[PDB]
């Protein structure tokens, strides 16, 4: 169930040796020593990665390290497609804003940061959660020189449990991180989007980066002169396999969860968030979907702007589905009632009050959130000519010096990133037209972007009129109406153009929206304050974990399928005969490699086929992840590298507020499969004689 | 692979049943000479199966097989389609037009009889071995003079099985006074509707309810309001036990077709021009269809049901391809051809390759032929509605070139032009769908093949398909209601002689019926090779391990209540639920819209002794016996051959086991007697039908 932080494995050890942990509590994590904590890693911002070797190898996911594949990618050399494999230390590829951190000490300092707190004064100050002031009180702790004593090393507070713990973390940052290894895409991101968040899934999701230092091993920027790192700890390399309900932890940095939703922020996520989410991208995605299969270029230009749409509808169908079937409502409501019912009868009222202020201000921003959800989900990312150029202070301020061609020359590069390689003003027109009907026939007049207003008082609300007439006026319509602009610009036509002011006009309301919205955060967050307090001051901490905040947590369960729906059950591991059978060569997304095809026709598997000669591609456990966890270590009973975490099956998306044992899972690339396509298909035998491999 | 055995066959078979978990006594099952469960089952209306489960002729059979009877008693005010039917008495079942239901009342080996018969061969190459007409002067010759008159209710039929080696001669009684007693509504009986189709796990209730009425003495009557009840032979017990994995199962029924003793030429033949040409042609239309029923609600309505009917042997074709590229049939049926030449070979007979070589060279000869049919087939007369448009009759012309008979053509293609452009026809989605399917059949079949009228779009119309069709349209007299309204006004020989729809539509037929004439005398020489075939296979291998093919007669099959794994890490059990119904409901789709009086029922739990031991609702189970079309509506019985479910559908993995059974794929997916008995009781209060069945604890 729970991501625990590293201070609460003491108190959830016991637990997991009689669920199978083998190993000593202090390899595992150690306050005051080496463990298996310091090989792990924050990759690049925000996925999880690993050290494997005494030379600095890390692991993390395919979809972790495509930025820098892609970056390294020329028609020439194309990486991203035929997989890179770096023969030699000296062929590892620098990567220009690149990160990975390492959790080098982590204390707990709430004593401290509450007596900090109690100079305060204003009592609904937000200090308690500011990063800035936590900043403050971090480098106070630390010292007035800690990063010039230390380097490499730098320090920093966070708020848990909605500001009733605080954690300071020393961390050792790694600027030169090198790309290793990547298998070919059909590999790496074999589903594609189709198998995104589905399992069984069949995708070989790696990539691996080698971190870089000076001398010493202290951290660097990139430098011809420095050498591979080598770290206080690696992880080992299992080749024994799963089976299942073996044990299984991970380690990563789970970003955000919301375990301590109310029941009211539970309807309000469905019927205000997800609910507008599903409806505007149906009607996005339609719309574009039907342009796409009509004209082989529309699906060239629109491939990526509609599966990045469909990425968040999914979640948000699957979050729906936990909702309307999972009870999420009903046991934040008994969650809620339980305290209410023990702080009347310890004489403390202020915990009801704290769950009553979050649910009046719930329903008090309703109408103010389903404006602002209608208008992102329906304009802001709906309708792409809401991000046409409009112009700035000093290009008005310029077109009325003869710097008119220095404005001309900015808004023309705006211009031409709008109308760019994949823009098409038909199928936007199109996509406008639904979207716009559906948002006017939910935002009333009077809440309407002003602009919006012409619908009903100029095109008699023909909504295809208003869309052709914003094309047909504007000086952003197309190519020709742009250049006789900026032959004769003039600020006059640029005031009145009709897209310049439907763009203005709908992030004029956009940001007013945010701004009204904004004050009613801080109410919520002080409540949950208290609201939380009295659930652990109840209950503790042993079922109520702190929610996600891109820290440093561990979580343990076991291999194992599931059934999805009556009379199916989904096991817990995938085949190389699964990528056969979803092999289809005229669907990029099901392209197989043909090394790997070779491979899996000569069942040249090596060591790394399971006891029966088949051979892993993933599994998936009931370890709970989340967004942050991407690349995890997965360790055996014995702390063993057995799997990286890549995913999460949609089923249990609303795991989030409700952790779902049912249909809740990791989904993890076994490393014997990674082991396999490093050697059979990236012939990369150095990586494998650098990692240490336990039979 | 695992058949569908001749009731002749029991008797070979009854010690690997029993070894499987049977337990009845052979001759309780099939006797010749006696009663047994065999005269319990009925073929239902011409196609499906039923079985007599009461003393007062109950019949069960599935809803799909009783829902054009169902829907004639359906009217705004009693929807008996939607709303179900229970008739609370015997008076209150409703009578029904031009139905059926066939007793198998006695079957006889009649091989040496018709072998003999034959001998008298006038034509070595004579196809009366086959023949119905001759199969019948045979039957009536040796049942007797007027033995219709002398057995009222009492035929006759000799039928031909295992290639012509041998032939059974059937008895069979016919009643058609059977009566609709019951039916649940449309939502439980078609819950899946068209998305389920061929899909496993399965959800629907896929039941109705009827009674074969009779004479006072139980003979066969047609409907008269004096007709009673009939008092059967035999019926079945309902068992209430249900179903465990492993439990033996068996099935009664009448398989319709099977290809069992395919060569592979013929494997090859089915997959690369039968199955790629209708999955190539379907998709293209369905395509085209489906994107004009989603941009208008209107064109939805008027497209569904032909949608819909395109896409069910579409999927089984996508199925039956499926098997053929992952299951080795070319190979297995290689295989199998390869072992009896090298047999025939040892025992100095070259007759039996000679056999398979003359099948080879003709599936060999026949290709092009038969792609150019299955591309006009599928394209033009399945692909293009304005293919089913009026052509004038010859006698329809002659009224047309000096008396009131121009008045009578006009009328009677004014009735072919209403009932071509019906409520349902839209001529603006039958040109989208005639430019996508021409554009298909031009690309595929070359100018010199061509139907002649399709010749115009490369030398009239500059290789336009768009600008050839919209022609047929602007100037045809059924291109629109006042384009048809102006001829009927002044009605010309001429005009319609030189009408561009007329001229497509006779010109596609005429290529059609000049290809299946081509392709006719083909069919002979691979009937006559696969007798010599089939014949060798069983002298070599037995009449034991291999079943005749299935030709609409009475089988019996047996296997086990087992589910499957479809795909890598995925696993169907054997058993689905109601709470799968539950998981499927969605209101806004009537195909999964939910009974409330069953959501109720669900909700209380008020299974009654209907639920299994662990509490919960069976809906459907899927067993490895081997089915195939007909066997809609089958008694399932259990070990002890008692009632356990109704065969109502198989899954499309198993479709390519007409040819080759799949162990580890194909199942028949089958109603549990329980949900059944749950519905008539819970959802439709009938209370007597229950009554008057006998039911095993
Ligand atoms: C391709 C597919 N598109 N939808 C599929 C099923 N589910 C629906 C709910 C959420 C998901 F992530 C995927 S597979
Ligand atoms: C609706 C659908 N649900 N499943 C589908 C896929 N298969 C393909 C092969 C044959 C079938 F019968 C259905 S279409
Ligand atoms: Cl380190
Ligand atoms: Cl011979
Ligand atoms: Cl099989």
Known sequence: EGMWLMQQLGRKYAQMKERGLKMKEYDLYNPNGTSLKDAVVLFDGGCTGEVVSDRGLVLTNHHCGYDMIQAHSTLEHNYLENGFWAMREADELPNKDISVVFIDKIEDVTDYVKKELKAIKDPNSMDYLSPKYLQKLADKKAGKNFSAKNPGLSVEIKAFYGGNLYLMFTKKTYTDVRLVGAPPSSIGKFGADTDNWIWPRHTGDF???????????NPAPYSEDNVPLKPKRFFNISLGGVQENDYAMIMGFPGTTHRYFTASEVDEWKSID?????????????????????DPQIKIMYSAKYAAS????????????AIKTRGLRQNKQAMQDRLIAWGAKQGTPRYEEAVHEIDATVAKRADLRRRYWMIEEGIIRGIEFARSPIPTEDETKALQASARKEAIDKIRTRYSKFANKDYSAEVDKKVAVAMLTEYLKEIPYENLPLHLRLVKDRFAGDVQA?????????????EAQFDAFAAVPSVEKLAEDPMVLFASSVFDEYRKLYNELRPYDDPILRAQRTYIAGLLEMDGDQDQFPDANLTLRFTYGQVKGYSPRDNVYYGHQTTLDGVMEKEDPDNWEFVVDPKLKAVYERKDFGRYADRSGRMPVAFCATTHTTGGNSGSPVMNANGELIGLNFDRNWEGVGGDIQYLADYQRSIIVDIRYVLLVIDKVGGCQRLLDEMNIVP
Do not use: T
């Open 466 to 478: 208003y869309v052709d007439d914003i094309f047909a006026r504007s000086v952003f319509g197309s």
């Open 310 to 321: 469909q990425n968040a509808y999914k979640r948000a169908i699957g979050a729906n589905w």
């Open 207 to 217: 990539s691996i980066f080698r971190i870089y230092a000076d001398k010493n091993g």
């Open 274 to 294: 997800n609910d507008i989410r599903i409806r505007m991208r149906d009607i996005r995605q339609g719309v574009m979907l039907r342009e796409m299969l009509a």
